[PDB]
């Protein structure tokens, strides 16, 4: 149902979900409250990030890379959020943080599908990899990402072509 | 100013203000921790022994000292903050 | 009371999320900084530079009002455009 | 007045009353803290040793002494308040 | 750089990284434990005695040391991590 | 392999595996308890004294030793398990 | 069997079995308490001193010893139960 008397068609493309905008300072387009990152890195991680010491090493590698970084997790909490926003405000890095979509078992279902088309790794709990052990190789690559109050969307990624039809092929068989 | 007794040592802390990594990452003061290093201000006579002998203190004047994070007691005099601690809590110098 | 300083203290408006929404709008037109939790600045670390400037303020049992501030003109036009675009 | 034994030293607290910063800001007594410094009135014979020797105390008469915040026990005599403490918890002088 | 006093020994840990069994089974880092062995970096003067003598330390420079799991305190300087520990909690060498 | 310092004693436990009574009754390993006896592997220099003298250790190489149930700390090296303990926790030999 | 080290003493308990009063009243084993007396089996070299001297132990072989109720540690070997302790826990003899 539309909020006005006119009927409109809205089309979105890519892997988009209903999270985003952890802090108001993650703004790159003050005209629209949209945080757009050019060639950004994404971080797939399935638990909360609150410890500063585990949070530091990932940006230590990403500041060397120089590309923007965007966080997907349950929550970037308190001190970990505090160092991220302050670092971004100083202008040394371009970063943003969003919540991961879904609730309950949807965490594993959605994060895996997010990571498959980005060319990176999910860094799930089963893999047994700590925050300090991450590097550029397992972080996926994307072209553009847009973050606002509710909508976070990705345009493309480094995911291999043959992987996404296989995920598509896996799903239609999973329909039954 | 203050005159230490026996093994008491006066330490002036670091006051490193903003903390940054060698790669340039800036850490806010909330995520910061109390410094474990300091500057020696004054030294007492030395550690007394059970036989009455007093051994000269190992630390000298003007040398930077790194100590235990929980060691030391804060003392305020003439508007300046000083950290006092005994030798056994002193870890290393320079 | 001793007369050395002249000061007053009031509560921040709103409840729940309204504190973040209101304090930022209070700080934007005063020319200062909100000193929010995200900025990671302790109370002892504050100075005169991030404290905003105002012309007059009146405080009573219920009403506290500000006449003007040091906020930049182009910032509020962005905010009103943002709010108008946020209306939808 | 009172005569300490061995390593006991008697300290008269500061009683600074009104607390103010060097900038003139006045702190109410509710927000105040007990003074950590005091004045020595009497000193005992000195620290006894395991071999029977008694070493002369380091502190003297009339010198201002800074001590631990928790150190000391309150004793009331002749309408006057005195703080007693041993040498091991004495921090520094002047 | 770091200069210990008396019976303090500087230990650089193993950082063995990937843990594997002799049979080839690989253990993830989340299932790992902090290493109990390390490399001695610097050694202080030695254990002070009650008679004022200082005995030469048993550990030397360049020897690998195995210690208690909970022993040691972390210190950060010049971008490097060093583990300081005293002799009494040092277990064995090689 | 490992070289103990001072009063450290290396003990290799029993590994008796199956537990049985003299009458033939077999006890499962769940009902078993950690052995209190072991074999000495290496001995340190000896107990140090307050005067600097080091007394020769009472235990020797290759003697079976019974110790306290809670005594000892586990150390892992080249795939072999060794139990280290000090002399004061050593109970008896043979 | 055991060879006690220094101040260790091997004690064989009473095992008085059926407890009865001099008046003939019989107490069941549930209401009984562990015996506080025992029989000395083996004695170590003696109490080591801070100067390196070893003093001859006061207890001898075959002396009937009464000890503290909580004192002692159990050691099992060749199907026989033996109780060990140190001299300071030994209360009295005969």
XYZ file of C-alpha atoms in Angstrom:
734
model
C 0.000 0.000 0.000
C 1.297 3.437 -0.957
C 1.236 6.354 1.469
C -0.112 8.710 -1.231
C -2.774 8.536 -3.932
C -0.266 7.768 -6.699
C 0.850 4.284 -7.733
C 4.613 3.934 -8.185
C 7.061 1.169 -9.073
C 10.261 0.760 -7.048
C 13.000 -1.618 -8.193
C 16.194 -2.470 -6.317
C 19.043 -4.688 -7.497
C 21.564 -6.616 -5.422
C 21.764 -8.152 -1.966
C 20.007 -5.632 0.288
C 18.588 -5.971 3.795
C 16.816 -3.981 6.513
C 19.728 -2.899 8.752
C 22.264 -0.082 8.808
C 23.211 3.347 10.187
C 24.701 2.443 13.560
C 25.964 5.990 14.149
C 24.924 9.337 12.636
C 28.559 10.206 11.858
C 28.812 7.520 9.137
C 27.774 10.007 6.454
C 29.394 10.600 3.067
C 26.463 12.380 1.352
C 25.063 15.011 3.745
C 22.433 15.924 1.139
C 20.638 12.563 1.483
C 21.679 10.784 4.732
C 23.326 8.119 2.564
C 26.709 6.532 3.297
C 28.222 5.486 -0.042
C 31.584 3.701 -0.103
C 33.676 3.358 -3.267
C 35.307 -0.068 -3.628
C 34.615 -1.076 -0.003
C 35.755 -4.041 2.034
C 33.186 -5.963 4.064
C 33.640 -7.894 7.309
C 31.387 -10.904 7.907
C 31.403 -11.876 11.579
C 28.708 -13.621 13.575
C 29.149 -12.286 17.137
C 29.327 -8.972 18.967
C 32.453 -6.805 18.762
C 33.145 -4.853 21.952
C 36.807 -5.495 22.767
C 39.154 -2.800 21.475
C 42.217 -5.053 21.225
C 40.500 -7.580 18.943
C 39.031 -4.712 16.903
C 42.362 -2.984 16.178
C 44.154 -5.492 13.877
C 41.573 -5.445 11.068
C 41.922 -1.698 10.474
C 45.695 -2.009 10.873
C 45.571 -4.119 7.715
C 42.869 -2.005 6.057
C 44.667 1.297 6.664
C 47.581 -0.251 4.770
C 45.183 -1.186 1.962
C 43.532 2.245 2.065
C 40.158 1.031 0.782
C 36.918 1.684 2.688
C 35.735 -0.955 5.154
C 32.179 -1.802 6.230
C 31.184 -4.011 9.172
C 28.459 -6.669 9.274
C 27.914 -8.232 12.702
C 25.423 -8.551 15.539
C 26.537 -5.207 16.991
C 29.531 -2.889 17.220
C 29.209 -1.992 20.883
C 30.537 0.822 23.071
C 34.328 1.062 22.921
C 34.599 -0.816 19.619
C 32.002 1.541 18.148
C 33.710 4.526 19.790
C 37.107 3.894 18.193
C 35.506 3.217 14.804
C 33.554 6.482 14.609
C 36.390 8.626 15.999
C 38.846 7.104 13.518
C 36.399 7.788 10.683
C 35.818 11.376 11.845
C 39.558 12.103 11.757
C 39.451 11.209 8.051
C 42.281 8.659 8.080
C 39.856 5.843 7.205
C 36.441 5.579 5.560
C 34.312 3.135 7.530
C 30.737 2.269 8.433
C 29.028 -0.315 10.624
C 25.668 -2.049 10.160
C 23.807 -4.852 11.872
C 23.604 -8.224 10.239
C 20.101 -9.075 8.975
C 17.811 -11.747 10.358
C 16.933 -13.293 13.707
C 17.636 -16.726 15.166
C 18.601 -19.311 12.555
C 18.359 -16.625 9.849
C 21.843 -15.481 10.909
C 23.574 -18.456 9.288
C 21.197 -18.481 6.313
C 21.676 -14.820 5.369
C 25.347 -14.187 6.187
C 26.458 -17.148 4.065
C 24.418 -15.839 1.126
C 25.902 -12.374 1.686
C 29.465 -13.715 1.589
C 29.080 -16.021 -1.426
C 28.726 -13.276 -4.056
C 31.319 -10.939 -2.490
C 34.321 -13.243 -2.960
C 35.214 -13.396 0.734
C 34.685 -15.746 3.661
C 31.903 -15.809 6.238
C 34.388 -16.155 9.140
C 31.741 -18.144 10.996
C 32.025 -19.481 14.536
C 32.724 -22.983 13.206
C 35.824 -21.798 11.324
C 37.428 -20.942 14.676
C 39.142 -17.759 13.463
C 39.605 -14.886 15.902
C 39.316 -11.204 15.015
C 43.078 -10.642 15.250
C 43.753 -13.494 12.795
C 41.874 -11.885 9.880
C 43.599 -10.354 6.852
C 42.855 -8.936 3.405
C 42.604 -12.339 1.712
C 39.426 -13.528 3.464
C 37.762 -10.102 3.321
C 35.526 -9.854 0.278
C 35.568 -7.087 -2.307
C 32.630 -4.984 -3.490
C 32.160 -2.077 -5.880
C 29.620 0.149 -4.095
C 27.576 0.007 -0.895
C 24.864 2.416 0.283
C 23.862 2.748 3.943
C 20.884 4.640 5.365
C 18.515 4.405 8.332
C 16.864 1.183 7.156
C 18.282 0.123 3.780
C 21.775 -1.203 3.078
C 22.450 -2.405 -0.464
C 25.431 -3.692 -2.441
C 25.872 -3.186 -6.184
C 28.344 -5.962 -6.948
C 31.191 -8.005 -5.597
C 34.218 -10.181 -6.248
C 32.267 -13.433 -5.937
C 33.060 -15.973 -8.628
C 30.397 -16.352 -11.306
C 30.017 -20.140 -11.096
C 29.381 -19.907 -7.345
C 26.206 -17.835 -7.573
C 24.282 -20.064 -9.989
C 25.331 -22.977 -7.772
C 23.787 -21.113 -4.841
C 20.811 -20.404 -7.115
C 20.795 -24.069 -8.118
C 21.026 -25.147 -4.475
C 18.039 -22.982 -3.545
C 15.516 -24.160 -6.139
C 16.191 -27.772 -5.136
C 15.831 -26.631 -1.512
C 12.358 -25.290 -2.364
C 10.889 -28.795 -2.164
C 59.658 18.735 47.372
C 58.582 15.530 49.102
C 61.319 13.493 50.794
C 60.928 9.704 50.445
C 61.691 7.364 53.334
C 63.711 4.157 52.920
C 62.578 2.287 49.797
C 59.815 4.711 48.771
C 60.244 6.012 45.216
C 58.526 8.967 43.532
C 57.298 8.344 39.980
C 55.931 10.920 37.536
C 53.672 9.257 34.987
C 53.880 9.455 31.209
C 50.953 11.665 30.111
C 51.152 10.408 26.535
C 47.810 12.151 25.715
C 46.517 10.834 22.347
C 47.365 7.185 21.665
C 48.115 6.202 18.074
C 49.391 3.028 16.450
C 52.484 3.052 14.208
C 50.077 2.719 11.265
C 48.338 5.943 12.347
C 45.144 4.565 13.907
C 43.876 6.897 16.646
C 42.488 5.355 19.847
C 39.995 7.410 21.899
C 40.631 8.168 25.552
C 37.766 5.884 26.617
C 39.568 2.877 25.118
C 42.857 4.037 26.664
C 44.386 2.474 29.771
C 46.475 3.850 32.608
C 50.161 4.017 31.597
C 52.504 1.452 33.133
C 55.620 3.636 32.757
C 56.745 6.785 34.514
C 59.578 9.131 35.424
C 61.463 8.865 38.715
C 61.342 12.109 40.708
C 63.030 11.248 44.014
C 64.460 8.183 45.757
C 64.666 7.403 49.463
C 67.534 6.144 51.583
C 67.082 2.525 50.503
C 65.791 -0.900 51.513
C 66.423 -1.683 55.175
C 67.606 -5.170 56.117
C 66.972 -7.404 59.113
C 70.533 -6.771 60.347
C 70.104 -2.981 60.238
C 72.049 -2.446 57.013
C 70.505 -0.196 54.363
C 71.246 -1.146 50.755
C 71.514 1.604 48.160
C 68.474 1.778 45.847
C 68.906 0.412 42.343
C 66.988 3.256 40.682
C 68.544 6.697 40.208
C 67.298 10.207 39.446
C 65.959 11.041 35.992
C 65.504 7.497 34.659
C 62.174 6.416 33.199
C 60.648 3.419 34.976
C 57.973 0.917 33.930
C 55.916 -0.499 36.796
C 52.911 -2.688 37.529
C 49.605 -1.288 36.304
C 47.993 -1.600 39.752
C 51.092 -0.472 41.672
C 51.479 2.978 43.182
C 49.414 5.366 45.290
C 48.356 8.858 44.221
C 49.530 11.823 46.311
C 48.600 15.475 45.743
C 50.856 18.347 46.811
C 51.107 21.998 45.658
C 48.851 21.242 42.688
C 51.066 18.500 41.225
C 50.253 14.791 40.993
C 52.959 12.318 42.029
C 52.952 8.515 42.102
C 54.733 6.840 45.021
C 55.762 3.193 45.113
C 58.319 0.972 46.804
C 61.162 -0.832 45.049
C 59.518 -4.273 45.099
C 56.737 -2.899 42.879
C 59.270 -1.365 40.460
C 59.615 -3.603 37.404
C 62.227 -2.173 35.035
C 64.088 1.016 34.149
C 64.223 2.457 30.618
C 26.113 30.766 45.854
C 29.587 32.043 46.763
C 29.341 34.292 43.692
C 32.613 33.248 42.046
C 30.758 31.692 39.087
C 27.271 31.997 37.596
C 25.799 28.685 36.477
C 22.665 26.577 36.130
C 21.817 22.956 35.387
C 18.868 21.476 33.479
C 17.820 18.027 32.318
C 18.126 16.939 28.712
C 14.789 16.881 26.858
C 13.001 13.767 25.683
C 13.006 10.111 26.666
C 14.650 7.046 25.178
C 15.895 7.870 21.691
C 14.662 11.477 21.913
C 17.788 12.479 23.861
C 20.024 11.787 20.860
C 17.581 13.461 18.467
C 17.142 16.600 20.582
C 20.673 17.216 21.897
C 22.114 17.119 18.374
C 19.508 19.658 17.254
C 20.302 21.702 20.368
C 24.030 21.600 19.594
C 23.782 22.318 15.856
C 22.601 25.933 16.161
C 24.768 26.795 19.195
C 28.074 26.422 17.330
C 29.434 23.767 19.692
C 29.726 19.993 19.880
C 27.245 17.501 21.304
C 30.021 15.618 23.170
C 28.106 12.388 22.609
C 29.102 8.962 23.906
C 30.304 7.936 20.437
C 32.911 10.721 20.382
C 34.678 8.995 23.286
C 35.572 12.210 25.128
C 35.707 12.133 28.920
C 34.442 14.956 31.123
C 37.968 15.966 32.158
C 39.051 16.142 28.497
C 36.588 18.914 27.591
C 37.695 22.494 26.924
C 36.278 25.853 25.860
C 36.627 25.126 22.135
C 33.945 22.422 21.940
C 31.616 24.285 24.309
C 28.985 26.172 22.347
C 28.161 29.861 22.577
C 24.756 31.426 23.213
C 23.453 34.952 23.714
C 20.718 34.551 26.350
C 19.080 31.642 28.164
C 16.100 31.730 30.540
C 15.401 28.935 33.034
C 12.273 28.426 35.141
C 10.383 25.536 36.741
C 9.276 24.117 33.391
C 10.560 26.218 30.484
C 14.138 26.722 29.312
C 14.661 28.719 26.119
C 17.624 29.979 24.098
C 17.536 33.167 22.038
C 20.342 32.485 19.580
C 23.561 30.627 18.989
C 26.755 30.283 16.989
C 25.583 27.501 14.672
C 26.453 27.791 10.998
C 23.618 28.927 8.744
C 24.085 26.295 6.031
C 23.872 23.463 8.578
C 20.275 24.116 9.639
C 19.074 24.439 6.028
C 20.555 20.983 5.504
C 18.713 19.776 8.615
C 15.350 21.193 7.509
C 15.862 19.685 4.054
C 16.828 16.408 5.731
C 13.727 16.499 7.943
C 11.500 17.407 4.989
C 13.037 14.539 3.023
C 12.660 12.437 6.182
C 8.927 13.259 6.268
C 8.278 10.491 3.746
C 52.272 14.192 75.525
C 51.824 10.472 74.881
C 54.873 8.210 74.634
C 54.944 5.795 71.672
C 56.672 2.417 71.800
C 59.205 1.151 69.234
C 58.124 2.246 65.719
C 54.981 4.239 66.558
C 54.822 7.859 65.359
C 52.109 10.335 66.344
C 50.715 12.582 63.604
C 48.507 15.673 63.917
C 46.206 15.963 60.913
C 45.938 19.089 58.783
C 42.451 20.528 59.480
C 42.541 22.687 56.355
C 38.763 23.293 56.634
C 37.713 25.173 53.493
C 38.968 23.473 50.325
C 39.658 25.563 47.230
C 41.444 25.067 43.929
C 44.272 27.397 42.842
C 41.784 28.910 40.367
C 39.495 29.905 43.262
C 36.821 27.208 42.930
C 35.453 26.241 46.357
C 34.682 22.577 47.093
C 32.030 21.768 49.732
C 33.028 19.631 52.696
C 30.721 16.834 51.507
C 32.868 16.433 48.380
C 36.064 16.798 50.430
C 38.364 13.924 51.368
C 40.298 13.274 54.559
C 43.779 14.859 54.435
C 46.687 12.532 53.690
C 49.288 14.809 55.333
C 49.936 15.704 58.947
C 52.338 16.974 61.593
C 54.496 14.803 63.858
C 54.340 15.464 67.612
C 56.031 12.430 69.179
C 58.284 9.642 67.909
C 59.006 6.325 69.599
C 62.308 4.658 70.386
C 62.588 3.132 66.913
C 62.094 -0.015 64.847
C 63.191 -3.118 66.742
C 65.199 -5.785 64.927
C 65.333 -9.570 65.110
C 68.808 -9.392 66.696
C 67.666 -7.054 69.489
C 69.053 -3.857 67.961
C 66.823 -0.782 67.767
C 67.371 1.531 64.796
C 66.726 5.242 65.208
C 63.495 6.441 63.552
C 63.805 8.333 60.288
C 61.159 10.940 61.150
C 61.884 13.825 63.525
C 59.853 16.306 65.569
C 57.809 19.034 63.896
C 58.119 17.855 60.288
C 55.033 17.592 58.095
C 54.408 14.003 56.988
C 52.234 12.636 54.176
C 50.712 9.218 54.827
C 48.324 6.655 53.382
C 44.652 7.614 53.293
C 43.651 4.480 55.240
C 46.642 4.662 57.597
C 46.335 5.608 61.248
C 44.054 5.017 64.225
C 42.204 7.801 66.038
C 42.940 8.332 69.743
C 41.235 10.941 71.940
C 42.887 12.386 75.047
C 42.521 15.682 76.940
C 39.974 16.911 74.396
C 42.470 16.675 71.516
C 42.546 14.366 68.494
C 45.809 12.631 67.569
C 46.573 10.157 64.780
C 48.941 7.298 65.633
C 50.774 5.246 63.023
C 53.814 3.022 62.617
C 56.793 3.630 60.345
C 55.935 1.087 57.636
C 52.820 3.058 56.647
C 54.628 6.422 56.768
C 55.052 7.609 53.181
C 57.209 10.743 53.079
C 58.132 13.973 54.858
C 57.707 17.506 53.471
C 66.284 -1.310 26.139
C 64.375 -2.798 29.065
C 66.584 -3.069 32.163
C 65.328 -5.420 34.899
C 66.113 -4.921 38.576
C 67.285 -7.765 40.827
C 65.436 -11.007 40.058
C 63.395 -9.852 37.049
C 63.763 -11.771 33.778
C 62.409 -10.664 30.398
C 60.832 -13.507 28.416
C 59.732 -13.486 24.777
C 57.038 -16.084 24.229
C 56.891 -18.723 21.518
C 54.280 -17.403 19.085
C 53.989 -20.856 17.562
C 50.888 -19.761 15.582
C 49.311 -22.846 13.996
C 49.076 -25.752 16.445
C 49.239 -29.283 15.046
C 49.697 -32.724 16.561
C 52.540 -35.018 15.440
C 49.890 -37.098 13.645
C 48.935 -34.046 11.559
C 45.698 -33.065 13.314
C 45.267 -29.277 13.217
C 43.847 -27.413 16.223
C 41.999 -24.112 15.639
C 43.093 -20.994 17.487
C 39.821 -20.871 19.443
C 40.712 -24.308 20.864
C 44.315 -23.276 21.582
C 45.869 -22.132 24.855
C 48.503 -19.515 25.585
C 52.013 -21.024 25.398
C 53.836 -21.921 28.603
C 57.335 -21.543 27.107
C 59.328 -18.545 25.969
C 62.687 -17.039 25.079
C 64.729 -15.078 27.616
C 65.442 -11.516 26.464
C 67.257 -9.836 29.368
C 68.126 -10.723 32.963
C 68.565 -8.464 35.983
C 71.279 -8.346 38.616
C 70.024 -11.378 40.541
C 68.101 -12.556 43.595
C 68.786 -10.263 46.544
C 69.424 -12.005 49.862
C 68.552 -11.104 53.441
C 72.248 -10.523 54.233
C 72.656 -8.021 51.382
C 74.357 -10.435 48.982
C 73.124 -10.797 45.402
C 73.376 -14.293 43.929
C 74.029 -14.620 40.211
C 70.874 -15.571 38.271
C 70.566 -19.142 37.054
C 69.138 -18.181 33.651
C 71.349 -16.709 30.926
C 70.831 -14.937 27.604
C 69.455 -16.838 24.624
C 68.063 -19.889 26.441
C 64.466 -20.998 25.968
C 62.459 -21.114 29.197
C 59.260 -22.948 30.150
C 57.216 -21.277 32.880
C 53.893 -21.368 34.698
C 50.843 -20.793 32.515
C 49.541 -17.929 34.684
C 52.976 -16.415 35.364
C 54.190 -13.149 33.878
C 52.850 -9.656 33.235
C 52.505 -8.057 29.810
C 54.421 -4.864 29.008
C 54.297 -2.917 25.734
C 57.165 -0.740 24.514
C 58.496 0.418 21.105
C 55.763 -1.630 19.411
C 56.937 -4.958 20.871
C 55.398 -7.236 23.499
C 57.605 -8.619 26.279
C 56.746 -10.931 29.174
C 58.425 -10.014 32.465
C 58.650 -12.536 35.288
C 60.688 -13.193 38.416
C 62.898 -16.203 39.102
C 60.644 -17.927 41.653
C 57.956 -18.508 39.011
C 60.511 -19.580 36.380
C 60.185 -23.349 36.038
C 62.789 -24.821 33.690
C 65.098 -24.149 30.747
C 65.279 -26.228 27.551
C 65.638 -32.657 28.158
C 64.407 -29.905 30.470
C 66.828 -28.464 33.037
C 65.235 -27.634 36.413
C 66.283 -24.651 38.508
C 67.091 -25.019 42.214
C 64.516 -27.223 43.958
C 62.478 -28.273 40.910
C 62.073 -32.024 40.385
C 60.857 -33.667 37.176
C 58.512 -36.592 37.813
C 57.237 -39.068 35.233
C 53.967 -40.506 36.497
C 52.968 -44.150 36.628
C 50.611 -44.645 33.665
C 49.289 -47.859 35.208
C 46.329 -47.930 32.759
C 44.039 -50.770 33.871
C 43.240 -50.904 37.596
C 42.743 -54.225 39.377
C 42.617 -55.429 42.976
C 44.766 -58.296 44.299
C 41.582 -60.409 44.430
C 41.030 -59.918 40.681
C 38.292 -57.266 40.727
C 38.690 -54.825 37.821
C 37.893 -51.134 38.361
C 36.839 -49.030 35.340
C 38.868 -45.949 34.484
C 35.898 -43.724 35.361
C 36.131 -44.937 38.969
C 39.928 -44.589 38.897
C 41.877 -41.741 40.484
C 45.025 -39.921 39.440
C 48.149 -41.831 40.549
C 50.118 -40.401 43.464
C 53.431 -42.036 42.478
C 55.895 -41.398 39.687
C 59.446 -41.674 38.399
C 62.002 -38.893 38.815
C 63.413 -37.737 35.471
C 65.658 -34.786 36.348
C 66.657 -32.899 39.497
C 67.747 -29.286 39.865
C 70.690 -27.781 41.702
C 68.932 -27.884 45.073
C 67.130 -25.813 47.691
C 68.570 -22.332 48.159
C 69.044 -20.924 51.656
C 68.801 -17.434 53.120
C 72.603 -17.321 53.519
C 73.197 -18.204 49.855
C 74.105 -21.852 50.443
C 72.506 -24.462 48.184
C 71.824 -27.853 49.765
C 72.012 -30.954 47.595
C 68.588 -32.423 46.745
C 67.505 -35.529 48.621
C 65.994 -37.235 45.561
C 68.178 -38.794 42.865
C 67.805 -39.967 39.281
C 65.543 -42.914 38.520
C 63.971 -43.404 41.956
C 60.214 -43.918 42.166
C 58.561 -41.151 44.191
C 55.118 -40.868 45.789
C 53.722 -37.337 45.952
C 50.623 -35.405 46.967
C 47.561 -35.971 44.796
C 47.176 -32.262 43.958
C 50.923 -31.579 43.718
C 52.657 -30.928 40.418
C 52.016 -28.962 37.233
C 51.693 -30.463 33.756
C 54.239 -29.467 31.098
C 54.142 -30.574 27.453
C 57.278 -30.871 25.318
C 57.997 -32.833 22.100
C 54.841 -34.893 22.622
C 55.798 -36.180 26.085
C 54.026 -35.377 29.351
C 56.172 -34.484 32.368
C 55.127 -33.626 35.925
C 57.261 -30.927 37.555
C 57.194 -30.286 41.290
C 59.298 -28.738 44.031
C 60.951 -30.700 46.828
C 58.558 -29.573 49.577
C 55.716 -31.354 47.751
C 57.754 -34.570 47.446
C 56.513 -37.082 50.024
C 58.640 -40.241 49.929
C 60.833 -42.406 47.708
C 60.398 -46.165 47.195
C 58.539 -49.407 52.306
C 58.512 -45.613 52.281
C 61.657 -43.530 52.751
C 60.451 -40.265 54.322
C 62.303 -37.087 53.390
C 63.368 -34.627 56.100
C 60.536 -34.143 58.606
C 58.084 -36.699 57.188
C 56.828 -39.503 59.443
C 54.944 -42.632 58.369
C 52.192 -43.567 60.833
C 50.071 -46.720 61.014
C 46.637 -45.986 62.473
C 44.964 -47.826 65.346
C 42.118 -49.822 63.735
C 40.606 -50.452 67.153
C 37.490 -51.778 65.356
C 34.709 -52.251 67.909
C 34.442 -49.220 70.196
C 33.151 -49.763 73.729
C 33.085 -47.726 76.920
C 34.666 -49.024 80.146
C 31.107 -49.581 81.409
C 30.476 -52.002 78.519
C 28.339 -49.732 76.325
C 28.874 -50.559 72.641
C 28.985 -47.750 70.061
C 28.182 -48.581 66.412
C 30.579 -47.721 63.608
C 28.276 -44.975 62.288
C 28.615 -43.097 65.590
C 32.352 -43.850 65.708
C 35.075 -41.343 64.848
C 38.397 -41.783 63.080
C 41.188 -42.688 65.538
C 43.539 -39.884 66.564
C 46.386 -42.226 67.586
C 48.710 -44.302 65.458
C 51.864 -46.383 65.196
C 55.058 -44.914 63.748
C 56.341 -46.904 60.762
C 59.183 -44.886 59.219
C 60.890 -41.585 60.026
C 62.833 -39.287 57.715
C 66.180 -37.580 58.147
C 64.819 -34.735 60.273
C 63.672 -31.115 60.289
C 65.860 -29.039 57.981
C 66.922 -25.649 59.333
C 67.534 -22.281 57.701
C 71.296 -22.674 58.267
C 71.419 -26.061 56.514
C 71.566 -28.142 59.697
C 69.253 -31.138 60.074
C 68.055 -31.857 63.613
C 67.436 -35.448 64.655
C 63.711 -36.306 64.743
C 62.059 -36.627 68.136
C 59.921 -39.659 67.252
C 61.433 -43.134 66.929
C 60.473 -46.423 65.313
C 57.732 -48.322 67.121
C 56.584 -45.340 69.196
C 52.819 -45.082 69.693
C 51.848 -41.583 68.554
C 48.654 -39.563 69.001
C 48.058 -36.945 66.317
C 45.589 -34.317 65.147
C 42.266 -35.541 63.776
C 42.628 -33.599 60.500
C 46.328 -34.397 60.023
C 47.640 -37.007 57.622
C 47.485 -37.952 53.943
C 46.629 -41.399 52.582
C 49.065 -43.373 50.412
C 48.307 -46.809 48.945
C 50.944 -49.381 47.990
C 51.040 -53.197 47.634
C 47.598 -53.475 49.227
C 48.627 -51.803 52.502
C 47.313 -48.530 53.940
C 49.907 -46.121 55.367
C 49.404 -42.661 56.872
C 52.070 -39.970 56.506
C 52.576 -36.602 58.175
C 55.183 -34.069 59.226
C 56.574 -33.462 62.707
C 54.626 -30.243 63.340
C 51.369 -32.213 63.030
C 52.596 -34.846 65.510
C 50.959 -34.177 68.876
C 52.424 -36.561 71.462
C 53.869 -40.032 71.998
C 52.894 -42.636 74.647
